[PDB]
Amino acid sequence: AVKVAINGFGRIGRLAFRRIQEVEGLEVVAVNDLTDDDMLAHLLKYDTMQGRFTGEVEVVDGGFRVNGKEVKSFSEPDASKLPWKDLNIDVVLECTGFYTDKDKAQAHIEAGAKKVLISAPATGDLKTIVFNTNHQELDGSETVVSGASSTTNSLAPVAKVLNDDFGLVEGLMTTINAYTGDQNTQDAPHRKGDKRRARAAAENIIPNSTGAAKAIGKVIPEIDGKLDGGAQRVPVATGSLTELTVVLEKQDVTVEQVNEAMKNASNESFGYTEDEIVSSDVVGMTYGSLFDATQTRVMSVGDRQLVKVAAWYDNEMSYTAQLVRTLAYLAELS
Amino acid sequence: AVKVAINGFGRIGRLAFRRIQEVEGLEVVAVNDLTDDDMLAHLLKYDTMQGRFTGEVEVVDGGFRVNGKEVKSFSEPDASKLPWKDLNIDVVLECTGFYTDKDKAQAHIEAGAKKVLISAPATGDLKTIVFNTNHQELDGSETVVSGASSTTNSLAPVAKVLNDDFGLVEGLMTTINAYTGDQNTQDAPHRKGDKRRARAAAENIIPNSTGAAKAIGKVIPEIDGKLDGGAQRVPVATGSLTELTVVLEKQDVTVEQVNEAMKNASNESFGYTEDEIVSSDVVGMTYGSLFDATQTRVMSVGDRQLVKVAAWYDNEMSYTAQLVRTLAYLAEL
Amino acid sequence: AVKVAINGFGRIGRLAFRRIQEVEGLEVVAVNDLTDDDMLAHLLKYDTMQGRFTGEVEVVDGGFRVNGKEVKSFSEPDASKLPWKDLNIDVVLECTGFYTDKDKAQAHIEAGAKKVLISAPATGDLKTIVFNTNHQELDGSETVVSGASSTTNSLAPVAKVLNDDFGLVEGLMTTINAYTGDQNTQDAPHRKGDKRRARAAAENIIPNSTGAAKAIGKVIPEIDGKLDGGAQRVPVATGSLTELTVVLEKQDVTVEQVNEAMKNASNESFGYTEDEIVSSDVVGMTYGSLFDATQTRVMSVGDRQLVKVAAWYDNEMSYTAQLVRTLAYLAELS
Amino acid sequence: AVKVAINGFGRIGRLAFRRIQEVEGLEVVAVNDLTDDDMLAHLLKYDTMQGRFTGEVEVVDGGFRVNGKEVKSFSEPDASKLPWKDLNIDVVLECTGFYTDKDKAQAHIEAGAKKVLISAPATGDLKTIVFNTNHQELDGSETVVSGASSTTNSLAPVAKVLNDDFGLVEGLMTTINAYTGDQNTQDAPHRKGDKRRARAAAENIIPNSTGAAKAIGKVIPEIDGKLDGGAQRVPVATGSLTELTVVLEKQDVTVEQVNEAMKNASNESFGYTEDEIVSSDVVGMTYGSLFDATQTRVMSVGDRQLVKVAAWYDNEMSYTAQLVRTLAYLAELS
Ligand SMILES: NC(=O)c1ccc[n+]([C@@H]2O[C@H](COP(=O)([O-])OP(=O)(O)OC[C@H]3O[C@@H](n4cnc5c(N)ncnc54)[C@H](O)[C@@H]3O)[C@@H](O)[C@H]2O)c1
Ligand SMILES: NC(=O)c1ccc[n+]([C@@H]2O[C@H](COP(=O)([O-])OP(=O)(O)OC[C@H]3O[C@@H](n4cnc5c(N)ncnc54)[C@H](O)[C@@H]3O)[C@@H](O)[C@H]2O)c1
Ligand SMILES: NC(=O)c1ccc[n+]([C@@H]2O[C@H](COP(=O)([O-])OP(=O)(O)OC[C@H]3O[C@@H](n4cnc5c(N)ncnc54)[C@H](O)[C@@H]3O)[C@@H](O)[C@H]2O)c1
Ligand SMILES: NC(=O)c1ccc[n+]([C@@H]2O[C@H](COP(=O)([O-])OP(=O)(O)OC[C@H]3O[C@@H](n4cnc5c(N)ncnc54)[C@H](O)[C@@H]3O)[C@@H](O)[C@H]2O)c1
């Protein structure tokens, strides 16, 4: 089996852990965070939005036991000190939010891990992967890889279809986004100095910047710099929606053609629906993106057309499913 | 003073009432709704999002007393039965949500009112007004008028500036919107059969249609049919944001030009800000629209440009302020 | 199989429907509500707090099809007009909220149903059942029965233990409750004239009355009138907690004795836990009540003692699970 | 004028600032927090639950300017290094949450301030004051004082009236409380290791412990140890309610007597209402406690009585109002 260690047992870390239970041939042997065992175990068992963990979870001294299997747990802020070498870690899932750079994440390799997959956009000389859009870029000699962002994974399969079938001139994106752990409960100073992430998360529409906007150019090179846009963080705890408004090379495009193009591209990463669903309907789903055809709009004024589409995503579970597929693929190549 | 009656003492009706207290020369002499006096008075005094009513509110039998002034109240579902004639009502503010058609609203006139201002887009042969964008269209012979929607009021002053200064080819709109009373508390059947407004309002991002998309053509005729878009209803109780993505006639447009063009057009209906505010910051505001310059984007790929802008609005108080200005102007004619 | 018709395909009706799929020998053959098929089918498939319906749901003209089985649907406000006779309905689950009286609910019997089970406290000459507290009261000659309320079901098994083991002098109850469909979205006039249920449901702590307070006397006659209390409706969409503060007949009672007395009484209707859970953790659970031992308090001043306990409950699924057990028992006697 | 410095420009610190503008003879000359000027100024102007600041706020380098008045600002985690001596600070309002101990708070004195008022319960050899209940205990020689907690301020005036008028045997408290800055946005490890405050704040009913429970004994000595209870943190951002269930020395008490006893005691710290208000209705209020007579209950079984009362409080502004009155009183004596 492929020996996985999770750095940062947060939202993405814990769900990665859950999802790996469902997936044969991957084994989490260790976790690292900044807290005690009791906490880690508790937060795995109980999950506000994602539901109770099915299996049995028990605290031991090593760490904790999940359906009989032991999981070593550590409490070490500095990744280079982790005993990855001694536990023959194959791949670290880096989920702390503090190693989002190729050079930083190199700490895990020095500790003894063979590969690192970052659960976010990351700066530096590395590949950025959305599963089922560009994982084929991986030859297996990669040492550090980025799994991109939630939004990127919701967007890439939609943009690919538009660019391939109609030609993408330009587009602007808005993502209507669940609030996350880096927002504040009450209006208060923000670590990164963001005056908007500083505000009460569950009481506000909060404009913010998005990675996706340009992480996208790294995933689909031929549309590099053709897309931009931002986020609106709103008071749902998980579940999100990406709206995309574009100018295409083909005019005389119909709503019917756009939808059919999307359906024909659907797979396990990219779902298709015609049901009038809402955000809570996508909580826990494992498509990386779910095209909602009921939201497709074409605006035609004389010669010229504007096209609008929207895709749903569980920014937690949709991203996690995608990240684990990338993990499994990256591991099968070496 | 100008004799006002409010039909439907709901969210817009009660705030209209409050706003009128701030504004000289308008007097609410009557309200009509579907409940008792105690309830009406209570819901005026206490307000979840808009805060406590400052003055004194006391229930009497006529209805209730507000800072000494009596307000007659009625419990009559059929508008034509209201004693408008006997109380010399000058203008009815129609806020029930059930008379949003010129012919229907005519009931108030038969009851004896001299004019009706509908607090929503309304079908039929009437003018649709966003104050400080097209109120000048009113000549004072109008009998039934629409005050448009809250989204239309957030959008009209933004669209006018783009169309005037840059030439508007086409655009798509998304409004990120507070939930309203015509949504359900828990997933349940919806009166109008909307499978999305049926869902838990405070637990969901809920896609929906918008009036504004095309009430806009009635307010700014020269851009009729050049705009469309929809809503996303989200778990805030009030405060909203209109995002607009457009293709303009001028290319080589800058973020700086767009912003300055908006600032130059600001007045009491159309505010301008460069502060990184969030929705709760606009709760209670009396601008009909607040342009947020931090959100302006310009996307340039070779020859061709996409422009994005965004304006805040308290769907409750921004619209109410705008409706009352329109009321006051309509009355002065 | 036992032929069930659900009147009022609301929160309790739809979940009753879902729960019945899990339970052998009960078959829902009809539903009645005030809307079209597309709506009924849609609201069964998708559920904000309770999650997606697992099976397949397809709209036909009769009504709709669930995992192949047809379900006739009706749009008829007046219960006596329903074709219960023609479909040989054995038991109607009455969930509309508008037939909470023995005489009113008799309409279903005139329509042709054999028994009616009301999903609330109901006035009149009928028995009030909390499953595993007093279902043994049923001899099978009953024609109209009440399934009590969700708070009654969370409280009854707790009060029975206290009264049996310690003797109950008197007590006061507070339930910290999820908001329900009879509260308003925004401050607005309320149908029943309740000035507090009129207020924005998800932005307020809202004091209110509770049925439980005295539905309890009908379930456990020997403590009739010994209990009272009210509700605080708060901004969670489901999941609730009953706090109970009592004077007992034994003094020198210990935390340890109270807890153990509860654990010893636990069954499928009454769960026991020592985990520091929160409301969302009980969403979807099928215990009618979940005793939380971490919340047990005993206050002793000289001779005299006050005792405090707390039980969780998903006001939706906990009540539904209980109602369906009562349905199944009532049908086995019939 | 009395020279005030606010240590910790958070929820209580900023509201203290606002409230001081309304109150003659107190002048804030400095603030300390852990962030830049732009942030401080921004969060004073804009307030999610409390509304926009009325006056003008402008950033300068000293710090910021409020209605023309300069306010120096600092970025210094260690209190003993603040230039309190050089700015002749009379009183520091200590609102960080990190100096809640008489010995720790002594750092401000070494820095040069003349007195410290801690905006929370604080350990060590000091007085704990709820204004209009026990501020008369201050003789002016005090150097470090505690302003108690929000719950204590909501509860003291209610318990004093019950104990003076009926004799308090014993009682249990439940506070249904707004969520605060020390809870998490999403389920995540908690600094203090509280498995409950670790959970999503705006999606949960969260049981927790309360200071009040026994800060109370320090404020009303003669009922020391006669009260206990806890909190339920719920998804409102501000506004709270304290429920109290008590056994009194007088039996044959009536609802009418209890209510009248409270009204007769009302002042600027203790309000009285018979309106069916909800939590949002007390947001911004400056009573330290508002007795709600609609919620008064008396439970009588034969000889023996249980009594229940409830008082509202804006855990932010009610506490702040109370804190400032104590500030003003403390300053007038020294
Ligand atoms: N919707 C989403 O939450 C989402 C989606 C996709 C990607 N991501 C990315 O995933 C990453 C983690 O996000 P999250 O939401 O789980 O955050 P989180 O706060 O819930 O989890 C972060 C975890 O890391 C721990 N931690 C912090 N410093 C550490 C250290 N040096 N060593 C070990 N543990 C440390 C914290 O205890 C916490 O458990 C972020 O980069 C985020 O950008 C988030
Ligand atoms: N954000 C907003 O609330 C918003 C903004 C702009 C315009 N509007 C429009 O204003 C109208 C009402 O808005 P609202 O949100 O105040 O709704 P609301 O539910 O708060 O108010 C409707 C009120 O009228 C009463 N009523 C309903 N039908 C009646 C009848 N037949 N006869 C007498 N009284 C009746 C109701 O009891 C209620 O008080 C709608 O058309 C809406 O589109 C709403
Ligand atoms: N926490 C809870 O939701 C809960 C728990 C226990 C009991 N209950 C009780 O069960 C009953 C249903 O509660 P709910 O929360 O599901 O309500 P709900 O509003 O979600 O559903 C009521 C349904 O009945 C339908 N209906 C109303 N009148 C009808 C009529 N005359 N004919 C046919 N259909 C009609 C409505 O369309 C609606 O779909 C209520 O009495 C409630 O007290 C609710
Ligand atoms: N409902 C309430 O928020 C409430 C009510 C009464 C009392 N209190 C108490 O008041 C205190 C503050 O609570 P709050 O909710 O406003 O917290 P807050 O988080 O909103 O404010 C605390 C502030 O202190 C700053 N800070 C932290 N350490 C500092 C340091 N060493 N030097 C300078 N600044 C520092 C932080 O940046 C933050 O702005 C706590 O003890 C709290 O328990 C809170």
User: With a 6 A CB cut-off, is C50 part of the ligand 3 pocket?
Assistant: no
Specify the ligand 4 atom closest to the Cα of D238: 1
How far, in Å, from the CA of C322 to the mean position of ligand 3? Answer: 16
Residues A89 and A233 grouped into a single domain: no
Matching residue, tokens 């709109």: B173
We report the CATH number of the domain holding residue C200 as 3.30.360.10
Identity at A50, one-letter amino acid code? Q
CA distances C37 to A281, C14, C79, C94, Å, are: 20, 13, 18, 19
> To 10 degrees, the CA torsion angle through A112, A114, A118, A121?
120
Q: Whose alpha carbon is nearest atom 38 of ligand 3?
A: C10
User: With a 6 A CB cut-off, is D11 part of the ligand 4 pocket?
Assistant: yes
* Minimum Cα–Cα distance from B246: chain A residue: A306
Give Cβ neighbours of residue B317 (< 8 Å, ≥ 6 apart).
Answer: B15, B19, B50, B238, B283, B284, B285, B286
Give Cβ neighbours of residue B99 (< 8 Å, ≥ 6 apart).
Answer: B7, B79, B105, B107, B108, B116, B118, B122
Taking each helix axis as running N to C, give the angle between helix C317-332 and helix C11-22, from 0 to 180 degrees, rounded to the nearest 10: 60
SS3 B169: strand
Residues A322 and A304 grouped into a single domain: no
Residues A144 and A164 grouped into a single domain: no
* Minimum Cα–Cα distance from D296: chain C residue: C229
Q: Whose alpha carbon is nearest atom 44 of ligand 3?
A: C12
C200:B38 CB<8 A: no
We report the CATH number of the domain holding residue D72 as 3.40.50.720
Query: Comparing C-alpha atoms, which of A148, A196, A312 is closest to residue A244?
Result: A312
Residues A81 and A124 grouped into a single domain: yes
Helix, strand, coil percent values for chain A (each to nearest 5): 30, 30, 40
Matching residue, tokens 């050899």: D125
Residues B134 and B162 grouped into a single domain: no
Sign of CA dihedral A279, C235, D230, D152: positive
Token couple for C188: 């607005």
How far, in Å, from the CA of C181 to the mean position of ligand 3? Answer: 8
Cβ contacts of A277 on chain C, cutoff 8 Å: 46
Give Cβ neighbours of residue C44 (< 8 Å, ≥ 6 apart).
Answer: C9, C14, C17, C18, C53, C57, C64, C66
What are the start-end ranges of the E strands in B106-222?
115-118, 144-146, 168-178, 206-209
* Contact status, residue C30 vs residue C66, Cβ threshold 8 Å: no
Identity at B222, one-letter amino acid code? E
* Contact status, residue A236 vs residue B204, Cβ threshold 8 Å: yes
Element (H, E) at B259: helix B255-264
3-state secondary structure chain C: CEEEEEECCCHHHHHHHHHHHHCCCEEEEEEECCCCHHHHHHHHHCCCCCCCCCCCEEECCCEEEECCEEEEEECCCCHHHCCCHHHCCCEEEECCCCCCEHHHHCHHHHHCCCEEEECCCCECCCCECCCCCCHHHCCCCCCEEECCCHHHHHHHHHHHHHHHHHCEEEEEEEEEEECCCCCCCCCCCCCCCCCCCCCCHHHCCEEEECCHHHHHHHHCHHHCCCEEEEEEEECCCCCEEEEEEEEECCCCCCHHHHHHHHHHCCCCCEEEECCCCCHHHHCCCCCCEEEEHHHCEEEEECCEEEEEEEEEECCCHHHHHHHHHHHHHHHHCC
User: With a 6 A CB cut-off, is A11 part of the ligand 1 pocket?
Assistant: yes
User: With a 6 A CB cut-off, is A153 part of the ligand 1 pocket?
Assistant: no
How far, in Å, from the CA of C237 to the mean position of ligand 1? Answer: 27
**Domain count along chain C:** 2
Residue A53 phi/psi, 5-degree rounding, is: -70, 135
Chain D nearest C-alpha distance from C205 (Å): 5
Cβ contacts of B183 on chain C, cutoff 8 Å: 185
Sign of CA dihedral B279, B280, B281, B287: positive
C278:D205 CB<8 A: yes
Residues B139 and B161 grouped into a single domain: no
CA distances B262 to A297, B258, B265, B266, B311, Å, are: 28, 6, 5, 7, 10
Residue ranges of alpha helices (H) inside D206-309 are 212-219, 255-263
Specify the ligand 4 atom closest to the Cα of D180: 3
* Contact status, residue C241 vs residue C312, Cβ threshold 8 Å: yes
CA distance D10 to C321: 46
* Contact status, residue B89 vs residue B112, Cβ threshold 8 Å: yes
CA distances C146 to A329, D215, D323, Å, are: 57, 46, 52
* Contact status, residue C35 vs residue B189, Cβ threshold 8 Å: yes
CA distance C23 to C5: 15
Residues B163 and B220 grouped into a single domain: yes
Give Cβ neighbours of residue D82 (< 8 Å, ≥ 6 apart).
Answer: D5, D7, D30, D32, D74, D76, D108, D111
Q: How many CB atoms lie within 10 A of CB A136?
A: 9
Q: Across the strands, what pairs with D65?
A: D58, D70
> To 10 degrees, the CA torsion angle through C290, C291, C292, C296?
160
* Contact status, residue B249 vs residue B165, Cβ threshold 8 Å: no
Selected residue of B48, B238, B312, B317 to mutate for chain D interface (largest D Cβ count, 10 A)? B48
* Contact status, residue B237 vs residue B255, Cβ threshold 8 Å: no
Matching residue, tokens 């509201």: D15
Residues D138 and D160 grouped into a single domain: no
Q: Whose alpha carbon is nearest atom 28 of ligand 1?
A: A96
Selected residue of B168, B169, B172 to mutate for chain A interface (largest A Cβ count, 10 A)? B172
Experimental method reported for this structure:
X-ray
CA distance B297 to A319: 27
Residues A267 and A323 grouped into a single domain: no
DSSP A133-191: TTGGG--S--SEEE---HHHHHHHHHHHHHHHHH-EEEEEEEEEEE--TTS-SSS---T
Q: Whose alpha carbon is nearest atom 28 of ligand 3?
A: C96
Chain B nearest C-alpha distance from C114 (Å): 28
Q: Which ligand is nearest to the CA of B323?
A: 2
First to last CA, chain B: 14
Distance of CA B18 to the CA centre of its chain: 15
How far, in Å, from the CA of D59 to the mean position of ligand 4? Answer: 22
Q: Across the strands, what pairs with B4?
A: B28, B91
Chain C nearest C-alpha distance from D185 (Å): 14
Give Cβ neighbours of residue A183 (< 8 Å, ≥ 6 apart).
Answer: A197, A199, A201, A206, A233, D185
Number of C-alpha atoms within 13 angstroms, CB side, residue B287? Answer: 25
Chain A nearest C-alpha distance from C105 (Å): 35
CA distance B44 to B36: 13
Strands A2-7 and A91-94, by their bridges, are: parallel
Strands A57-59 and A63-66, by their bridges, are: antiparallel
Q: Which ligand is nearest to the CA of D186?
A: 1
Token couple for C9: 């395909």
Residue ranges of alpha helices (H) inside chain A are 11-21, 37-45, 102-111, 150-166, 212-219, 255-263, 317-332
DSSP D80-105: GGS-TGGGT-SEEEE-SSS--BHHHH
Specify the ligand 2 atom closest to the Cα of B119: 10
Residues B219 and B309 grouped into a single domain: yes
Selected residue of D48, D206, D245, D298 to mutate for chain C interface (largest C Cβ count, 10 A)? D245
C185:B180 CB<8 A: yes
Specify the ligand 3 atom closest to the Cα of C32: 33
Number of C-alpha atoms within 13 angstroms, CB side, residue A225? Answer: 5
User: With a 6 A CB cut-off, is A90 part of the ligand 1 pocket?
Assistant: no
Chain C nearest C-alpha distance from A322 (Å): 21
Identity at D156, one-letter amino acid code? A
B171:A241 CB<8 A: no
CA distance C291 to C261: 11
Strands B240-248 and B168-178, by their bridges, are: antiparallel
Token couple for D135: 């501020």
A235:B236 CB<8 A: yes
User: With a 6 A CB cut-off, is D101 part of the ligand 4 pocket?
Assistant: no
* Contact status, residue A38 vs residue A14, Cβ threshold 8 Å: no
CA distance A256 to D271: 64
Chain B nearest C-alpha distance from A73 (Å): 35
Token couple for B39: 């309830």
C284:A51 CB<8 A: yes
Domain with B332 in it: 1-148+316-333
Residues A159 and A73 grouped into a single domain: no
A176:B232 CB<8 A: yes
CA distance C190 to D97: 43
* Contact status, residue D89 vs residue D117, Cβ threshold 8 Å: no
Instruction: Supply the DSSP symbol for D269.
Output: S
Q: How many CB atoms lie within 10 A of CB A266?
A: 17
Give Cβ neighbours of residue D24 (< 8 Å, ≥ 6 apart).
Answer: none
SS3 A297: strand
D39:A185 CB<8 A: no
Q: Between chain C and chain D, how many beta carbons pairs sit less than 8 Å apart?
A: 129
CA distance C332 to B94: 57
Selected residue of A177, A185, A192 to mutate for chain D interface (largest D Cβ count, 10 A)? A185
> Which residues in D have their CB inside 8 Å of a CB on B?
42, 45-46, 48-49, 51-52, 275-278, 280-281, 283-284
How far, in Å, from the CA of B96 to the mean position of ligand 2? Answer: 4
CA distance B302 to B305: 8
Q: Whose alpha carbon is nearest atom 15 of ligand 3?
A: C11
Which residue among A11, A36, A46 sits closest to D193, beta carbon to beta carbon? A36
> Which residues in A have their CB inside 8 Å of a CB on C?
42, 46, 48-49, 51-52, 275-278, 280-281, 283-284
Chain D nearest C-alpha distance from B256 (Å): 23
User: With a 6 A CB cut-off, is D95 part of the ligand 4 pocket?
Assistant: yes
SS3 D122: coil
Query: Comparing C-alpha atoms, which of C272, C280, C267 is closest to residue C314?
Result: C280
Which residue among C205, C280, C310 sits closest to D241, beta carbon to beta carbon? C205
Q: Across the strands, what pairs with C312?
A: C241, C290
Sign of CA dihedral D117, D123, D124, D127: positive
To test the pocket of ligand 4, the residue of A186, A187, A191, A192 to mutate (highest count of ligand atoms within 8 Å of its CB) is A186
CA distance A143 to A158: 29
Q: Which ligand is nearest to the CA of A30?
A: 1
What are the start-end ranges of the E strands in B185-258?
206-209, 227-234, 240-248
Task: Compute the C-alpha angle B73/B79/B82, nearest 5°.
Answer: 45
Listed as own residue / partner, the contacts of D107-111 with beta carbons closer than 8 Å and 24 or more positions apart are D107/D78, D107/D79, D107/D80, D108/D7, D108/D79, D108/D80, D108/D82, D108/D84, D109/D143, D109/D144, D110/D80, D111/D79, D111/D80, D111/D81, D111/D82, D111/D83, D111/D84, D111/D85
CA distances A77 to A90, A103, A183, Å, are: 20, 17, 21
D234:C230 CB<8 A: no
Residues B70 and B133 grouped into a single domain: yes
